[PDB]
Every structure is written in C-alpha cells, then in structure tokens.
Write an enzyme that holds these catalytic residues in place. Structure first.
Site, PDB file in Angstrom:
ATOM      1  N   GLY A  95       0.854  -1.160   0.000  1.00 23.82           N
ATOM      2  CA  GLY A  95       0.000   0.000   0.000  1.00 23.82           C
ATOM      3  C   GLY A  95       0.893   1.212   0.000  1.00 23.82           C
ATOM      4  O   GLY A  95       2.070   1.065   0.312  1.00 23.82           O
ATOM      5  N   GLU A 136       3.373   0.805  -4.702  1.00 26.07           N
ATOM      6  CA  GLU A 136       3.349   2.095  -5.340  1.00 26.07           C
ATOM      7  C   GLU A 136       4.699   2.774  -5.088  1.00 26.07           C
ATOM      8  O   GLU A 136       4.897   3.297  -3.998  1.00 26.07           O
ATOM      9  CB  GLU A 136       2.277   3.036  -4.731  1.00 26.07           C
ATOM     10  CG  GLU A 136       0.731   2.912  -4.881  1.00 26.07           C
ATOM     11  CD  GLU A 136       0.036   1.891  -3.984  1.00 26.07           C
ATOM     12  OE1 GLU A 136      -1.057   2.170  -3.498  1.00 26.07           O
ATOM     13  OE2 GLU A 136       0.592   0.821  -3.758  1.00 26.07           O
ATOM     14  N   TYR A 137       5.630   2.738  -6.040  1.00 24.13           N
ATOM     15  CA  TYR A 137       5.468   2.084  -7.333  1.00 24.13           C
ATOM     16  C   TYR A 137       6.832   1.528  -7.734  1.00 24.13           C
ATOM     17  O   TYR A 137       7.788   2.192  -7.328  1.00 24.13           O
ATOM     18  CB  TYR A 137       5.066   3.109  -8.418  1.00 24.13           C
ATOM     19  CG  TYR A 137       3.682   3.712  -8.268  1.00 24.13           C
ATOM     20  CD1 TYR A 137       3.498   4.983  -7.697  1.00 24.13           C
ATOM     21  CD2 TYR A 137       2.600   2.917  -8.620  1.00 24.13           C
ATOM     22  CE1 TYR A 137       2.199   5.449  -7.460  1.00 24.13           C
ATOM     23  CE2 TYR A 137       1.313   3.377  -8.383  1.00 24.13           C
ATOM     24  CZ  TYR A 137       1.128   4.624  -7.802  1.00 24.13           C
ATOM     25  OH  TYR A 137      -0.154   4.958  -7.478  1.00 24.13           O
ATOM     26  N   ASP A 205      -7.526   8.858  -7.668  1.00 25.93           N
ATOM     27  CA  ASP A 205      -6.536   9.878  -7.295  1.00 25.93           C
ATOM     28  C   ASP A 205      -5.754  10.440  -8.480  1.00 25.93           C
ATOM     29  O   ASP A 205      -4.538  10.617  -8.509  1.00 25.93           O
ATOM     30  CB  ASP A 205      -5.557   9.340  -6.255  1.00 25.93           C
ATOM     31  CG  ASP A 205      -6.312   8.673  -5.136  1.00 25.93           C
ATOM     32  OD1 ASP A 205      -6.256   7.467  -5.090  1.00 25.93           O
ATOM     33  OD2 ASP A 205      -7.007   9.301  -4.360  1.00 25.93           O
TER      34      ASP A 205
END
EC number: 3.2.1.14
Length: 392
Positions: A95, A136-137, A205
């Site tokens: 995450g 990410e990422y 986003d």
C-alpha cells in the site's frame, strides 16, 4: 466466468470509521482484500495490527477457550467466507504508506523467497484465499524486473501449497496496479500478467492537493473540450494494458467510494488553493456523506465523471454518483473487462444509493458475478479454531 466485484477492507476501519468485517454486504462481492500487511527488510511479511487483525474479541468469541486461536478481523472474515461461499478473501501487502519497503527485499533472491514464504505462511494460517501486493510504485527498470521476480516467487509458493493439497483449491495472486502512464510504463506488464489471477487497476486519485487546477479524480474518458479537468483517465490505462498484452477480462476497474475536495474554486478545471475538510482526513470525503448541504452535483456521463460544487463556499468534491457508477459498470461490460474493485468498504451508502449495488446490478446483478467457491480447508493452520473450521 463472469464479473469480479472486489473491495478493500482496510484493517483500521474498525477504529474511528466503526466498520467491522461483519458489516459487509458479502453477497455483493467475490473478493475481499484485507489491507495492509507490512514487509521487513528481510522480506518478512507481517501483520500491521495484531489487535484488529488477530486478537480483538468480537461478540461470538469465547475470551477463555481451549486451543491456540485467532480472533480479530481474520476470524470474522473466515466467518464471512463460511456463510458466503463465493466470497474469497486475500491478504493485501504494501500500500502507499508501506510501499517504501518493497524494493530492498525484492532485489535479493533471499528477500523475495522470504516474501513468498512468509506471505504464504500467513495466507494458509490466517485462512486467506490468496495474496495481493500493492507496490506504489516499482520506481525503475530494476525494481520493475524485481517485481516480475517477486510475483513469480509468490505464484510458485502458493502453487507448491496447492500441490501439497491436491483435494483443495488453487490460490489467488493479485496486485493493485497504477492507472498513471508514468508509473505503468515502467512495468514489465505482460511478463507479470503470466503470474497474476487478475489486476485491480487503481483508477482513482487522478486529481487532488498536488494539482493546481481542480480535476476529475477517477474519470473514464478524457475531456476534449476541457483537457485541464481530466489529467488522467481509466480508459488510457486500460487500452495501454491491453496493447501491452494484459487480457482485459483480467483487468478489474478500480473505483472510489470517497471523493477528493478542492477549496476556493470556480468549478472543475479552474484553480483551487487548499482542499478543505474531510470526513476523516483533509481534502477527502466518504461517499456516504455526499452530497454536502448547499452544493449542486454535476454528472458528466460522456467522460463518466461527476462532482458536487458549492457556489458560495467555492468547494469542489470530485466523486461518483450512481449514474456515474452505472456509466462505469457499462464501461466494464462493454469492454469485456474483469469487473470492478473498490477502495474502500466503509464509505459506501446502502440500498438503492449504493455505488457498489449499482455496479453489480449494471453488471447483470449477482448471477453474472464470477462463481469461484472459496477455500475453507486450511489444514496447515497454526491456529486451532481456524484449522477446525471455526465451531462454537
């Protein structure tokens, strides 16, 4: 099979948001992604919140009780699975906040091996149907490469487990993937696809505080008239993925159940300075709190985007309406895509105003969702109540 309906249960939602796993309209989904497990430099995957995850006692849990036992949202999710047998659960690792610590284990065979092994141990003990990585990422050609190798390791690991249990189910490996071109263009997408069950494209986003002009944060199509209001789009990503070699039916369109706000604005595409309040953090609002008093809601179906805007306070919150959820569902069906994913389960409204209700019904209703029975047999679990399939 038909469509996947995937949602994140964010471990911390049992605190201030008051949302426990029990409160999931389970019949509406096919995959819960329990987020998020953290990673140690070793590559050792571990549970971010042992209280919420495994130790908390809900109604139904003997505080006393024989056996070395699991409680928390893991016991509650296994209970959800017993009842809703087409509900699979996967443990999500990484995450945004934990993603800084992927790169280091991912670079070494040792670290990736340790990732795959700790990941699987945790999957088979905690009663999960698979694992979902959210990096990410992968910031460069080397990280990109290492992400093929990590997924390969993880796939191999879960497969070896299936081999050991031929009478059981095969297990899932998924990743939450980037809709932004500057990020997925670095990925070795086609190679990675060989290992993956499906891909949950994080199609949100696209706009927020980092911008200078208010934009559509999760729009499907580019605004040709108003280019500035749509810096990104679901559709750019999806078609690129496909041209790279990912089967669209393996691409789950990620969808927000929250909206991102913009302060002192004249409307979408103009400048804003600040982001305002939020339901829990600044600039971010739960969909179930929308529409805000005194704002008029605009829905641009064409590009499948919407927002509310309050004329006096000059406040813009980009979020989806059931009409736009419809337009999204429609894009899923029309493009032979794998279904829809959501972030995240606490913020939806219920009933006829549920965005996820809308998408499932526009998908053809639950009868059209992918039918894959989940795994209840976890023979090697280190917990006794879970290994015995949770009696009373």
């Amino acid at each position: 099979g038909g469509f996947r309906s995937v949602v994140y249960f964010v471990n911390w939602a049992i605190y201030g948001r008051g949302h426990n796993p029990q409160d999931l309209k389970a019949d509406q989904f096919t995959h819960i992604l329990y987020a998020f497990a953290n990673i140690r430099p070793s590559g050792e995957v571990y549970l971010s919140d042992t209280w919420a995850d495994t130790d908390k006692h809900y109604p139904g849990d003997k505080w006393d009780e024989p056996g070395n036992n699991v409680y928390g949202c893991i016991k509650q999710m296994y209970l959800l699975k017993k009842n809703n047998r087409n509900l699979k659960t996967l443990l999500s690792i990484g995450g945004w906040t934990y993603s800084p610590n992927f790169k280091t284990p991912a670079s070494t065979e040792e670290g990736r091996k340790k990732f795959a092994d700790t990941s699987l141990k945790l999957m088979k003990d905690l009663g999960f149907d698979g694992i979902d990585i959210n990096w990410e990422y992968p910031e460069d050609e080397k990280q990109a490469n290492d992400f093929v190798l990590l997924l390969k390791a993880c796939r191999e690991a879960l497969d070896a487990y299936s081999a050991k249990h031929p009478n059981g189910k095969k297990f899932l490996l998924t990743i939450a993937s980037p809709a932004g071109p500057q990020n997925y263009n670095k990925l070795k997408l086609a190679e990675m696809d060989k290992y993956l069950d499906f891909w949950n494209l994080m199609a949100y986003d696209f706009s927020g505080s980092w911008d200078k002009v208010s934009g559509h944060m999760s729009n499907v199509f580019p605004s040709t008239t108003k280019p500035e209001s749509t810096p990104f789009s679901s559709d750019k990503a999806v078609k690129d993925y496909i041209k790279a070699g990912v089967p669209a039916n393996k691409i789950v369109l990620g969808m927000p159940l929250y909206g991102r706000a913009f302060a002192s604005t004249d409307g979408i595409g103009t400048s804003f300075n600040g982001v305002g309040g939020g339901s829990w953090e600044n600039g971010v609002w739960d969909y179930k709190d929308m529409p805000q008093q005194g704002a008029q809601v605009t829905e641009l179906e064409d590009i499948a985007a919407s927002y509310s805007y309050d004329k006096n306070k000059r406040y813009l919150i980009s979020y989806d309406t059931v009409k736009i959820a419809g337009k999204k569902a429609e894009y899923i069906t029309k493009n032979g895509m794998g279904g829809g994913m959501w972030w995240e389960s606490s913020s939806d409204k219920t009933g006829n105003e549920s965005l996820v209700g809308t998408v499932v019904n526009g998908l053809g209703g639950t009868g059209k969702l992918e039918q894959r029975e989940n795994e209840l047999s976890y023979p090697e679990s280190v917990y006794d109540n879970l290994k015995n399939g949770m009696p009373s």
